[PDB]
Amino acid sequence: ALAEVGRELVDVPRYLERLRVLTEEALPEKLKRFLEYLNRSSDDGVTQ
Amino acid sequence: DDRSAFERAAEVASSFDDLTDIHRELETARKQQRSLQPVADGWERYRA
DSSP states (O other), X not given: OOTTSOSXXXXXXXXHHHHHHHHXXXXXXXXXXXXXXXXXXXXXXXXX | OOOOOSSHHHHHHTTHHHHHHHHHHHHHXXXXXXXXXXXXXXXXXXXX
């Protein structure tokens, strides 16, 4: 996601903006995945 | 006779895969965030 960016001072704000964006948008992934996975159950093992 | 098991075992184990992958992705993203932050700190000190 940032490997293409260079190694200069002008590149630094690109890194900072990407870091902020991923910080903001990682939490939605956490929610939409783990909250849905909270519905999982292990009834099959017990039943069988 | 033989009316054994070891068939439903994989069926039960199949559930964990998506959760494991999602957890891996989330942890990798968070690790990248921790890596990114000190760059911002150093840039602040550099501007000072």
